[model samples]
Target: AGFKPAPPAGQLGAVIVDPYGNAPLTALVDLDSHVISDVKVTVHGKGEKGVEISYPVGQESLKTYDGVPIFGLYQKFANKVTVEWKENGKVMKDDYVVHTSAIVNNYMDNRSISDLQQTKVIKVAPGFEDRLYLVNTHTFTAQGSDLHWHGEKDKNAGILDAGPATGALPFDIAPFTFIVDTEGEYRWWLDQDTFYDGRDRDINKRGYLMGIRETPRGTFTAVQGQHWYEFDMMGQVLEDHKLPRGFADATHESIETPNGTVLLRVGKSNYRRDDGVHVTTIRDHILEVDKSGRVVDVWDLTKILDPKRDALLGALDAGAHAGQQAKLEPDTPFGDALGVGPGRNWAHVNSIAYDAKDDSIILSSRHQGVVKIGRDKQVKWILAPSKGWEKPLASKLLKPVDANGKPITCNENGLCENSDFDFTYTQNTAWISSKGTLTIFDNGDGRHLEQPALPTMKYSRFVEYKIDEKKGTVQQVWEYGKERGYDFYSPITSIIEYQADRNTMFGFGGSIHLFDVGQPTVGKLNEIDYKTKEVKVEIDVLSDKPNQTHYRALLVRPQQMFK
Candidate 1:
């Protein structure tokens, strides 16, 4: 029998705790072959109040340790820690004192132009002298320091101490500046937050349509009263373009085109439901704008993708609900009141890239697969899971094959029968490489599936695929992480960027939420040599609270652009 009555009472074992390192405060239980379940750890602060940070030692915890279970600890605090569990039908508790110092401190705060001008410039990578632009979403923490709020003045510590100079950069920099001393050399741009759905929650949208240029006197800021910014013959700043009325609710980020056109990911609005009275479901459009801020062309995914939804629903089983819900659920941060159920997030499109090579557009969707659309607004092909599609429809999909060109099939648990390709779920930021390869931040959501049983995934990776447009086949040339690696997963808000000239690939682990453990202690931006698969730069991003995370990151040559 595995169980027996308790015979004697004595000291359990020696408990060892380590409160240092970037990892969480961990304790190892020094017990014999005996195993413990329902293990829980609580930390009592200065006051009597305490919080339990460790989960019950179940299958997950047991799989990793024999008697020790790990617990998460907050920074800049000391606590009387207690561990409790049951062994042989008796409850036991152990107590210890743990002090955790801040692992990192100097973080950039992107709140004001003056703060940015004073921000330190730390070069992370060598030779590749591209000035990076990112928002400091979280306050920086240093050794033995408390959280610093945005714009909080600390004459000794300096206001907004944590920033790019502090060895961390956030996902996107909103209207960020790369300050230089020379006149007409300082370059700055703002990514204004826009709102749709008639909610008008974001007051910043009133100034969203603006850009900046520095003059001998000071910075000359221009609002697109009705137009966007204009560029002069020498690419100098000019205020001359006009934007369409109420076209600023563009999601994600925008990019300047080679031909002076602005490419924008504009969220679709005023979508009338079948009832005609209700306008709910949120969709998005890829808009190409002239220098005058006028929308010259628009590719509305809602109108083009409606029929595809019906086609998808009919082809898959009920288990497809996980994938379907990912598409239909409106992002909680932006539009909550305007979401219409069932058909809510039809296009939940997050990012777009224009391929001047094929005269096509690439869109990254949270629910559907990465799609290639022709200039005529026709779906050329979809690179995604083929199991859910009807045979005829599946034919339009580029079958992911291995080096051997065999089809990728999976079991109920999502284990692949062939090593060639594994499907992605809820992806972001698809870009075409300089060599015509497709790169994606594969935020695998419900990766492997078992019908009726909810699927679980805990890894996110960047995948590079080489496609033969004519043959309609895809070969996954490279990937960054293991499918089973839980540490790489990010449930939302991540991006993958490639710099072909330098043969570099940057992977942003934005909102990297690992399984049931908890949110990561910090986000990460990694630069890799794609050909060698070697990491060149690894930047750990820290924040004050758990809810604060990043959405985008772009490498810019500030020295070159402003020179």
Candidate 2:
């Protein structure tokens, strides 16, 4: 059956809070088809009609993140409320009759900060109590001397990795911890391999993904400091394994599925033409692992598409070879095959998701837009720019738009350009409901595709797409960009369905700034109204310092709190 548009919620009022005790932020309540009208809430209890306590603004006032009796808002808001619903430039709905609160900056309260890479807040407890879990990600280091063992050359890791707390910038080893009221869990990242300091210093000669997970009782480092170790909602330690040769390469995003956890990894058994030598390459793959940690199913991109096809060597002489060199250099020409195997292709997997109902897994290739693989590992679909990609495809790429009905093209530093592929990263992807609504973060950089041909580096954008699975077609549905007050086109992203409402989408980016690197500003948890296609509520990011930010997974709220 064809999908139908979701009905409007008539008037929607959401519970706004600081969860971390920070107050006086704006609360935009969207109405009239969810077309955000712009409402700002403050803790000082000042607003129209003297309804100061109209809508509460703390963490202690609400029962859940969802819609309920915002008793706190009513209890706190006496008069002088700052509601967006107003009359002729004045206040209209003096009080939203909604419930909200500003809880303690304690373990239960989640505050605001500008350094986190990304943040995720969810209700984990069963009933009442208003308990929530917040997970944040931060890229804390650039200069570490660990990549040497990881097979990479010595290079500076950067400021976040080495600065001290006194420096005002969270340095490398920025010391992460899930801090709640009573308990705390320190969080850290360990890259498997070489580490570099700006000065070209080297650390542990051997590189491995290793870190310690501490509970109130004890701590456990990665078994032998493997390249990857992450825990999930249930505190289950995630182990990692290097795929065998000829398999996919290492990638991020381990999605949970009914059958198993879907892991998107990279591999090098494919083909690459460097100099004159046609080198077999390391490619990307999506591996489905069952509970026993066995690869139950796999989908490799190389099998479904030809890397050599799009190997854009247009600029170079058609007959140029690796030139008597034994190995390919870092700046090797990756012309047409910009996203192929090793070399400059940078064919890395970024994110993956499983559609249990369809028995399919979706993988987002940083180089090649997005792809869908069946449980059998067969290519089911693909989305890429029509002009460029390898031929013989599953699907086509799409261009989306925003609420203003504008043409959605790649911005200067946002999504697709040609110069810097490294700067163009696909952050997160998710489906709004069992429906066709799809949301993603399109990170843009001034860097364009530079290998085969030179594309421009663009900005970051949060976009939504519609997929007709039965018809095998995907279309751009919605998007948010700089015009709409987005920070810099960021790399990180988040899309979620809140309160069972299909149109309400919450989006946050990992990096809010383009060049500055203390931490991306506190991410904005935007409430997007699908029907009217507008951002109603936006919460500036929280729980990070000048340097400390979030990573792929960092506990939030109760989890980060522990009180």
Candidate 3:
């Protein structure tokens, strides 16, 4: 009360001695003003084997005087620190026993979509200084108690469930929802999925806006549910374009153009045409969409393939007249062996890539063959088996390799009369880089169809091809999972991404059959060293329900574009 008459209406307050036991020691100093000269901190050991650390003003001390300078002691045995500093020509020192909570290396950080199960924070493979983004899906249901409008405290609100039920969530985590490792703020915007498959309704804020962070301080927003997107470091959405309404994005990844346009594989089924053929054709198109979602260019692949089919059939018909067995019966479209049938899904174009240097488009048709469409929308070449009942485009196609690296032989008449190597069956994710390196996810679906020899079992492979455009030939340069014993078979959605800088590739076994006998489906994300032909990392996702299966998995650095 006698504090110099209380300083007469100024900012005078009592000397409160409230002790914060678990508070960190902090101080604010005007470093630029030079009111404080030097600051030194020394961490003292607590045990006999404990280590000591020291900090000085010149090189070791923290320079800025922010709101609070925090010193972290990761060593569990660190007991106290001695902080010494000179202020206004007076030297003062204080002892501080850092109050830190027990540190835990948790693999999970927060609740994903449903807030029921904690989403696991996946660790990147060792020796790599980067993070990963796992695009995953899980079954979720709304609780019965939260019938109409669920409250936050209602534990029955959004919960993980077994399968689709009456009150279950409409869809899985809208395709390409990336689960990240680092901790920070994120939000998922409830936007409309592309109007496809009769789903034209707006989500109306019912879904979450998706975003991820590489660190706690910052993160960038990713525009989810696009047909395709790309991210820079700091998790910013570099591209966020969608397919035009009324067309469904294919089950393959979209490629970006050199000029920022996106080349998408979009299709429409049962589409009637002016060609007088009313077959239920799910014709695939190579759509080039600009940043404003305008379809800048369109290449109806059917326009190129339909004529190729007719020409091959006509040639076969002529051969039958000359006492030779015709490959196709007259007055019939090629019968689909895998049963997607006739014109419908006849050319199930799954993957697409742009050859910017060559000014061509590489289209991978699961039902037919791989074709490169030139700028004029003409088929430059095709890669398929030369002689099979289903090989209609064999006359214009090149040969492929068998299980071995041996090239399959095409007879003089453009027929695969014999060969050691078999062409890919039901291939997907055909990527042709600007340098003409063609890669494909070869899902060995019709292995028994090969003549003279056939694979006894199903197998999948990630193959790289060196394309020789001048000779219209493709040479198998590299392949993973080609060996018999180390194969992973996935008939459906899968991808093999190559990282050239590291000489590594990520092969995703989209629908693994490892534990098909009662075990929930498990998908594998394999990191392979393509140079050594060895798997460096194998991360598996074990599903909780039998109905859960991965659409596709990608091993991307969540912080690749971070600043």
Candidate 4:
């Protein structure tokens, strides 16, 4: 149903259910006044308290609250919606009740009710108990593998081919995006049909979608195979910006600036080798697109960095890629020797963050490490180990040191040996947190650029590095997860975010197949008190079926995203 406008310029309007047709549990109420933009909307929960999300009402909504949104409602029940807006220097408030359908359950959570029962809330902190989290998850029924070779191994340990991850994942594997609280309630959900249609064969083939994030512009945006979409809480798609040609493999990451420009991590559409054969390149390009979907700027990371370096490329599953096999040293180049085709996965730039202060960007490359570059396209700093680095690039490497400012012991080969301080390896989410400390997930894969004795021997942690550009030194200010070890270890697809509450969250989203130990696959999350290292909130994002997991988790609050 469309928005129900209020009675003229004086009062409130009627409540509209499924205002956008796609959000079954959401409703809209028109304020019918334009006096204020500071509007707050609350969807009262079953617990008798309300989970509120406020936003500065946009012009479209302020006119009649015609488009003002209300979410976090429960299905199969009459949900109470509260709208509060300022008018004539006074507060105006009203309530509306909306009832949604019970059948809506099948379309959300991407699992049967029996499967959702697997999720667990191990702990709940006071403030965190009221907060909401968004898990970018998917189901095994539809295996959504990447466009290029990512070496997602098969059940038999067989490496993937040039096309599929191992073999073609069973089709119809759909994505599951939902908002859940620490108390284990599903507050909001995005309909699966909202992403792919039967017409798009490519999207249907991959059978999965991810990279969904709350953009800075106050809308939810995500990237599928070849398209980028911006939508609202009511499931109304604000913008469906398709990727232009020459920009293929719309994989991880979409960063929005304060001005509304979006940055996407994609592969160059097609690559032509020196011998004149065309192939593909994955996770090696960043494109800046305006609202109209025009390419405003481009950063060809393959050209920006030394693509020839194969330090951690050896970690690719046996026969997953080319000449960058399980080697002792990274002196060779990526050649077409192994499976997963001749396409280059050279620089797996998984995530990117914009630094408006200096117009630079920080990127996390799973094959490499977290590094920062300027608008001039110069490498400003490298946060990885110093092996396989030459004169110019090597000089930009950040020296590892302790909190006391003492250097970690290292040999002439640039290997720093320290039990307390280690560079980020296969890390994700390189964002600038408080006081200019670079926070990283620090997925400790291939630590020291060599495979650990066992997969369980590795562990991931949330680490913050304080850098001194003038002195070219970096100090490990704080960290967590090394002591937890294997129980918390994840080899890929993990993230760490700094929260405003002086706490941090780490999503141990993906894990290596531990068939040997009969360990079940689970997505672990912990909200940690930064100073005390106490786990204030702990959640296990679980699915009943095997091979199901989450990719990332974010504290998704409408008020915070809009602000």
- TM-score for every candidate vs. truth? 0.56, 0.50, 0.56, 0.82
lDDT of 2 at 254: 48
Ordered from best to worst lDDT, the candidate numbers read 4, 1, 3, 2
lDDT of 2 at 78: 36
lDDT of each prediction vs. the true structure? Answer: 0.48, 0.37, 0.46, 0.65
- Rank ordering of all candidates by TM-score, starting from the highest: 4, 3, 1, 2
Kindly list the per-residue Cα lDDT of model 4 for residues 255-301, writing each as its tens digit.
77777788887766545555454444567778889889989888877
lDDT of 2 by residue, 1-563 (tens): 99854333224544333221222122233332322222334322223322122232222111122221111132223322333333346544334433333221211112234332233333222221221123333323334322311222212335455421110011123222222110111121221121212233332212222122222212121211112333322232444444444442243344455543535444443333343333333335555654445677666566655444332222111111311212323444322233333433444455666676678767665555566667666666665544355334624333333334344455422343332212123435543444555556665322233221221123555566666656554555555563544344453443343323334444555445423444434544444566664555443444344423333222222222111
Clash totals for all models, in order? Answer: 21, 140, 16, 8
lDDT of 3 by residue, 1-563 (tens): 54452111111111111012121121222233334446665645444533344445432122322111222232233347565767668887656544433322111122222222123223344554232435433322222112111101212334663221121113223332333222211111111122111122333212212222122212222322234444422122344555476444233445556676666664543344554333323436667777687888888766666533422222221210221322444334321212223343456676777777778888877656678888898778887655332334445676554545466665432335464234566677777633348878886654323211322255788888876677566677778775643237765566776777577876767656633544445566666787797666665655444424565655543122112
Q: Which stretches of candidate 2 lie over 4 Å from their true place?
A: 1-133, 139-145, 149-251, 268-283, 308-340, 343-345, 394-427, 430-432, 446-459, 469-472, 485-488, 492-503, 517-522, 531-537, 542-563
Model 1: lowest-lDDT 10 consecutive positions: 164-173
Stretches > 4 Å off in candidate 3: 1-126, 129-133, 136-176, 179-251, 274-283, 307-343, 388-395, 400-420, 433-436, 448-456, 484-487, 514-518
**Candidate 1 C-alpha lDDT tens digits along 365-403:** 665667888889887888665544554545577765567
Q: Give me the displacement of residue 326 in model 4, in angstroms.
A: 3.7
